[PDB]
Design a protein around this ligand. Structure first.
Ligand SMILES: Cc1ncc(Cc2c([C@@H](C)O)sc(CCOP(=O)(O)OP(=O)(O)O)c2C)c(N)n1
Ligand SMILES: Cc1ncc(Cc2c([C@@H](C)O)sc(CCOP(=O)(O)OP(=O)(O)O)c2C)c(N)n1
Ligand SMILES: [Mg+2]
Ligand SMILES: [Mg+2]
Lengths: 546, 544
């Protein structure tokens, strides 16, 4: 004790999760995990945060992982795990270190082949783990004797690749005896790679660094930011991995998005004489539908699973080790120009809110040490191009792109860093998929600023195909009234409806000033209104489907 | 004159769905399915009914299947289909004929291995179909050259087994040319089975029939009901397959649930000299945690996959064909007795669980469908005797909480003339509440009871009665319809606390066929119906 005044498999698992930095476990209870849940409740160093449903729990764990750099959630066998699998798939796609724990029937029930609840009544308890093979880096069915090695094996794989892993935990196994961990869980080609990077950077007249999502996966943002700060090297990111570096760096150019990039940024990146890509994946939504021009002949790219050194593929290196050794490089100093930074100002009028003006206002009014979370739809595509301030971050999911993700994800991220004020931008259509975590937000007394874009349906989809087709319409809820209906009082959540630019600035300032309450702001915009980038990207998506 | 002087693969699929009797398609749009969606919207013979999310869409299609006897839903590649997979798993477990259509990127995009949205950015577009293998009877990724063959193959498997099937439909493939279908979709072993059943029923002095969920799967309820009515044979069902026969039959004994059965029913079933089981599976929640006593030496059981004739296994038979030939058997008439069959008088007393289900039993009418969610609702409602032409939807094998709300709406869409009564707990409603918008848009008139007992009471009864994980955030449930956009001409919302209030509101609801009823029932967290008090401890022992 600080004052100076049987261990089980369940304790071992929880101790290892604590080592990973996890202080909160998400999910939904079931009879097959209640005894292990008791162990979670008893922990002084970690909190159970129960969700309304398992898909939302998986999304929430993903957001938490993006900020905390590790996460865990708990489901019940069959019905819980299968409800969550789309969230885990997203975590695999965008490479987030999430542990799913699945409580399963006792070893004896499984071995007896009993037709119990949450099964297909065929006595086979292994179908569901098999179904997770494509979306997990490692998976295990624990036994009393295998538990400590199996837990360590799969969590070591989480540390190695920062992809999700899967632990099936039978009821009786969690209660079985174990002993405390003895040790914690935590170069030639690597040194060659560093020498070639050093040589290339020093010889380059116009170098450019491109940082991506795998930097975020490994929590290497501060490391890359420091490297770029010290060397003054020009840097850009895709919208996939936005905030992989601090956007207040003087050498940060903006977001490269193929032919949809700002012209001066596009010209700079595409005329660079050397390109260093760190943890980047080029996807449709992050390259203006594959209209990027990045010359492999002038490039060294480093990813988790491979590196390409001027066209030579290498696999025998550690991505984290190489990136962390970049500030052993001395004497690299860019002496050229960057591009002109446009002046950021927003002067409101009484005009009704429009998309392009909305994002101009958000850019101006967002502060340092805030996290912007933006949903697929007008929100992602508008917010993607805003210049973030010092120590500010971004969460978007452009590869997996599961609408509804951002609401639970914003809440998980907000729990992960209570000192970083989260601003959520989510569409009306997207909120309807995951709205039930509003209850959790109230119970946990979270204080994010949530903006719900009521544009009477799926505007991003209207921009791609069938602008006046009925399938792009949704039932209109009274969005501003949701907190009250879900049990919130005025001293917990402040709810608003905003129609004009003047109203938006007033509420935004009011919300930003009041750090001790959650804000729930219904923004009314026209269904035909889309931000400039989305008007362009919509037609590219449409072309891709022809 | 005086002088003497196109059809596509998408259309083909929709024509086949029409053939299956499907008039509504559920789901959620995505760019990879919008052009196929245009084809659905254009149809005169079926309607797109868009859901809030895909899990709910799969649940809704399942409920629709239970009543309509076939169903379809549409998702987008990756994110849509994986969101729905728990619903499809439940349809596989409980054997419902649901078709999932997944809209996927163009064949060119797939062949080029492009890193497009809703993928793992590895160029592989086959992972998600593989993930469906254990929960589908058949699956296909359509090409322009195999599309009609493959549609017919998988829909024929749906007809054969009545389990869910899966069709991945690339954008360009749906728009590819096709020709209208040339053919419609559709032994001694069966004769021996029928003869052995006939002989056993002829010679039996105390036969009993047990009907199960696979009867519901094949739409054989009326067939089995007719057979039992003609022969006067004693019949029971498990709670898994409740309403596989009409419960108003004179020879309907009640629900057999192992040692938790009513004593006279248990004694009757377990002393029968011959047992005929039709489409039954014995599961923990449907046998009082495996405390049933059914002697295979006295039994002929028929299932979709397998038949057992006095311990001898048979497989070369058509389950539907055999069940459909039972009314042709002769010299079968039961001449014995059954088992012996209180007026419900309400008071101002606060609502309690056992009294609630007594009231429901007394007030339920003919031509209703009762839907009951895992929790106090299922365990209470499962023993109510249904009136004539009334049905039940419960999911005791798969047991996914939240299922019943979308399922109840889907079933209600499937049969507009059966008034649906839903009993769902507060904890369960919180998983699937967003389909309230759909119910309002579609002007559905079910009667919905939400059991507000301040958390997960069934779980409290199993383990940790005062542990914080059994608590949930309390919503103002009665206010949900209003907040989701309902007006008073569409939904009537109320909070009910007493027995008098309950009888009044249920009667009021049943009398008003033109509006939806949304009724919050207030009960204590410690209160559970008698069956659940027992089952809670049996689950606890099962997890030792
Ligand atoms: C789980 C799921 N289902 C379906 C989709 C398809 C889809 C998107 C594809 C393109 O990813 S964008 C979109 C509409 C989002 O509408 P909104 O939230 O109202 O946003 P806004 O009106 O501001 O554009 C859908 C349904 C998806 N991405 N994820
Ligand atoms: C999708 C999902 N998640 C979790 C469970 C576990 C579970 C049940 C296991 C046993 O199936 S029963 C139950 C509580 C239901 O609570 P309620 O709806 O408030 O019902 P009541 O309070 O009336 O008992 C849960 C969470 C489940 N069945 N399905
Ligand atoms: Mg919208
Ligand atoms: Mg409850």
């Amino acid at each position: 004790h600080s004052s100076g005044l049987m261990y089980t498999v369940g304790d071992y698992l929880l101790d290892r999760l604590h080592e990973l930095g996890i202080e909160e476990i998400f999910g939904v209870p079931g009879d097959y995990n209640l005894q292990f849940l008791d162990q979670i409740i008893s922990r002084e160093d970690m909190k159970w945060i129960g969700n309304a449903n398992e898909l939302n729990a998986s999304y929430m764990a993903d957001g938490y992982a993006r900020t905390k750099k590790a996460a865990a959630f708990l489901t019940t066998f069959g019905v819980g795990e299968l409800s969550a699998i789309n969230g885990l798939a997203g975590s695999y796609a965008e490479n987030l270190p999430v542990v799913e724990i699945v409580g399963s029937p006792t070893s004896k029930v499984q071995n007896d082949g009993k037709f119990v609840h949450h099964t297909l009544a065929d006595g086979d308890f292994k179908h569901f783990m098999k179904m997770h093979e494509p979306v997990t880096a490692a998976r295990t069915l624990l036994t009393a004797e295998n538990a400590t090695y199996e837990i360590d094996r799969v969590l070591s794989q989480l540390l190695k690749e920062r992809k999700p892993v899967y632990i099936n935990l039978p009821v009786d196994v969690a209660a079985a005896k174990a002993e405390k961990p003895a040790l914690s869980l935590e170069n030639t080609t690597e040194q060659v790679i560093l020498s070639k990077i050093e040589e290339s950077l020093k010889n380059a007249q116009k170098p450019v660094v491109i940082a991506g999502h795998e930097v975020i996966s490994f929590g290497l943002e501060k490391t890359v930011t420091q490297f770029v700060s010290e060397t003054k090297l020009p840097i850009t990111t895709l919208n996939f991995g936005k905030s992989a570096v601090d956007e207040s760096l003087p050498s940060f150019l903006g977001i490269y998005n193929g032919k949809l990039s700002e012209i001066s940024l596009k010209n700079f990146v595409e005329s660079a004489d050397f390109i260093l890509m760190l943890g980047v994946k080029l996807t449709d939504s992050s390259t203006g539908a594959f209209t990027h021009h990045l010359d492999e002949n002038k490039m060294i790219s480093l990813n988790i699973d491979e590196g390409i050194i001027f066209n030579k593929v290498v696999e025998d290196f550690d991505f984290r080790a190489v990136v962390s050794s970049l500030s052993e490089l001395k004497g690299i100093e860019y002496e050229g120009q960057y591009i002109d930074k446009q002046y950021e100002e927003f002067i409101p009028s009484s005009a009704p809110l429009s998309q392009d003006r909305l994002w101009q206002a958000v850019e101006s009014l967002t502060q340092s040490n805030e996290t912007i979370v933006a949903e697929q739809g007008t929100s992602f595509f508008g917010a993607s191009t805003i210049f973030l301030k010092s120590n500010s971050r971004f969460i978007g999911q452009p590869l997996w792109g599961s609408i509804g993700y951002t609401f639970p994800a914003a809440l998980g991220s907000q729990i992960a860093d209570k000192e970083s004020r989260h601003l959520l931008f989510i569409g009306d259509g997207s909120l309807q998929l995951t709205v039930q975590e509003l209850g959790l937000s109230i119970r946990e007394k979270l204080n994010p600023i949530c903006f719900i874009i009521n544009n009477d349906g799926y505007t991003v989809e209207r921009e791609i195909h069938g602008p006046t087709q009925s399938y792009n319409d949704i039932p209109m809820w009274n969005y501003s009234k949701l907190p009250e209906t879900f049990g919130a009082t005025e001293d917990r959540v402040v709810s608003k409806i905003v129609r004009t630019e003047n109203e938006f600035v007033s509420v935004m300032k009011e919300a930003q000033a009041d750090v001790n309450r959650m804000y729930w702001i219904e923004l009314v915009l026209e269904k035909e209104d889309a931000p400039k980038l989305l008007k362009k990207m919509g037609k590219l998506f449409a072309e891709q489907n022809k």
